[PDB]
Amino acid sequence: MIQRTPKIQVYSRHPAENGKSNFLNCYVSGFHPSDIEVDLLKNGERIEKVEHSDLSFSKDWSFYLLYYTEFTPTEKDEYACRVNHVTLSQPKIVKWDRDM
Amino acid sequence: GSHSMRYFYTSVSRPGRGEPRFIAVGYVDDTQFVRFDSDAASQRMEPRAPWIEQEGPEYWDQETRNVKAQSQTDRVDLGTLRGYYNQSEDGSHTIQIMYGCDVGPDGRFLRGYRQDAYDGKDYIALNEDLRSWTAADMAAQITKRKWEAAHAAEQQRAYLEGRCVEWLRRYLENGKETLQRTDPPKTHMTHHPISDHEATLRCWALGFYPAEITLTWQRDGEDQTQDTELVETRPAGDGTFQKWAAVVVPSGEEQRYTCHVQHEGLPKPLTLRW
Amino acid sequence: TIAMELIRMIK
């Protein structure tokens, strides 16, 4: 049975400016099967009301999904994406880095 | 330039958790326009781009009707393929389907596509000539013969060269104001010392459409594919895309490096230097 | 518009 680990990218829609409204994205791709759980974290805690794109896939049949929410970044607030998938022993947590 | 229309189907069985889940999405180029989700409440093919909303109620009734039918087809195929591979009743399995057509700048047919997969790997694919099938394994050989005995390749070609291209052209027209623009990338560079000897140079491309883009590093005018990092092109969430390419350089040597950006929306390819 | 012709291509 083919199983592939998701690639993960956490980033904002626009280069972040403190006090300015923006969008927090977690893009998961290259995974199989499609069963996946993805959360956005503000200072460790789960953000409710997060939306995602409609499930789709690339030429190699691996799935991809965009999870997102609106937010206004500040100096103190830390954001992360937590991806839970059959292929991962513990959910992978990627921290948002403003320049990645 | 050229254009494509593409449909993606995903059926996933879930033994014990009820009936299989079915998702369908449709694309024109890199823009999604329709969606169906068998678990959603509406039970309708739904719009995802403004220009498709101008299609009447009859369009939506037929699309809804056919996508539902496809989901039932995948449903029995799921059971049938479980038999071919001698799989047990209790595991979760996946059928994926992609099909669509390409047209040239003039609107002419260029090529068609039809590919299926089972559990993440190739099952059966229509060949370039739209006339024959390539079956990846032994269970698909059985399916390959069923489809030869049904002349399904002609029927595929009928859609791909018929309704596919002509509704593509229609969509492109009804959405000219949006589907035929190229947003060029807004570029910038960042610079971060790693230590007292090294720094990261990162070349950014933002807000571009379509997704096809090339970022490449050079050192003294020669391609550098070594101590570089390229991220997968990614959706910004507003219809445009992002990409970046980074390089670790010796301190004081950043002026030797250039980032080059190729995109359809650019009158000519950019060169960036720190 | 989706291809109706796939609906019958049972595997």
Question: What residue spans define the domains of chain B?
Answer: 1-181, 182-274
Count of other CB atoms within 10 angstroms of residue B197: 9
Q: What is the CATH number of domain B182-274?
A: 2.60.40.10
- For residues A85, A86, A87, A90, the Cα torsion angle rounded to the nearest 10 degrees is 70
CA distance readout (Å), A35 to B78, B94, B204, B208, B234: 17, 10, 32, 30, 21
CATH fold group of domain A1-100: Immunoglobulin-like (2.60.40)
Closest residue by Cα to residue A16 from B206, C9, B231 = B206
Out of B25, B231, B234, whose CB is closest to A56? B25
CB A85 within 8 A of CB A5: yes
Q: Which residues of chain A neighbour B237 with C-beta distances below 8 Å?
A: 13, 23, 25, 66, 68
Touch of A by B (3+ CB pairs closer than 8 Å): yes
The verdict on whether residue B271 carries a ligand-binding annotation is no
What are the beta bridge partners of residue B200?
B192, B248
- In the block, tokens 């999870």 appear at A67
CA distance readout (Å), A57 to A12, B9, B198, B200, B238: 22, 9, 38, 32, 19
User: Measured between CB atoms, does B150 come within 8 Å of chain C?
Assistant: yes
CATH fold group of domain B1-181: 3.30.500
CB B95 within 8 A of CB B117: yes
- Residue A76 Cα, gap to closest chain B Cα (Å): 21
Q: How far apart are CA B196 and CA B218, in angstroms?
A: 23
3-state DSSP call for residue A3?
coil
The single-letter DSSP state of residue C5 is: G
**Cβ <8 Å between A23 and B237:** yes
Q: How far apart are CA B261 and CA B215, in angstroms?
A: 5
Closest residue by Cα to residue B74 from B128, B117, B111 = B117
Taken as a whole, chain A contains a residue count of 100
CA distance readout (Å), B47 to A51, B4, B34, B140, B235: 17, 18, 5, 34, 19
Residue type, B85: Y
Tell me whether the omega of the peptide bond preceding residue A73 falls within 30 degrees of 0, making it cis: no
CB A57 within 8 A of CB A38: no
Two structure tokens written together for B120: 């993440």
Taken as a whole, chain C contains a residue count of 11
Two structure tokens written together for C4: 């109706």
Q: How far apart are CA A13 and CA A21, in angstroms?
A: 10
Q: How far apart are CA B235 and CA B247, in angstroms?
A: 23
**Cβ <8 Å between B150 and C8:** yes
Q: Where are the alpha helices (DSSP H) in chain B?
A: 57-84, 138-148, 152-161, 163-174, 176-179
User: Measured between CB atoms, does B76 come within 8 Å of chain C?
Assistant: yes
Nearest Cα residue in chain A from B91: A1
Q: Treating both helix axes as pointing N-terminal to C-terminal, what angle do B138-148 and B57-84 enclose, rounded to 10 degrees?
A: 130
3-state DSSP call for residue B73?
helix
- Residue C6 Cα, gap to closest chain B Cα (Å): 7
**Cβ <8 Å between B26 and C2:** yes
What are the beta bridge partners of residue B85?
none
The verdict on whether residue B258 carries a ligand-binding annotation is no
* Listed resolution, Å: 2.4
Residue type, B167: W
The single-letter DSSP state of residue B150 is: T
What are the beta bridge partners of residue B164?
none
**Cβ <8 Å between C9 and B63:** no
